[PDB]
Amino acid sequence: HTPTPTPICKSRSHEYKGRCIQDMDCNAACVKESESYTGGFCNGRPPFKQCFCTKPCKRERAAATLRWPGL
């Protein structure tokens, strides 16, 4: 159902993903860490916090949604 104007993907790194609670920082960390990722957010989960990066994936939606999904 057009979840976005473009295909967005997410991938975990191996440098700036251990101690971070600021999504803004985690974003610049990725875009600054590589050249393929154009974004990224930070999330705190066990055992320790982790950082996730985002990049301009391919395809469009590769799925559907339809109306009245349920309750």
Beta carbons of 49 and 55 less than 8 angstroms apart: no
In order, the DSSP letters of 8-56 are -EEEE-SSS-SS---HHHHHHHHHHH-SS--EEEEE--SSS-EEEEEE-
Q: Look up the domain containing 5 and give its range.
A: 1-71
CATH number at residue 71: 3.30.30.10
Task: Give φ, ψ of 2 to 5 degrees.
Answer: 50, 70
Method: NMR
| Cα torsion 5, 11, 15, 21: sign | positive
Number of domains in the chain: 1
Write b or e for each residue in 31-68: b if 16 or more Cβ atoms lie within 10 A of its Cβ, otherwise e.
bebeeebebbbbeeeeeeebbbbbbeeeeeeeeeeeee
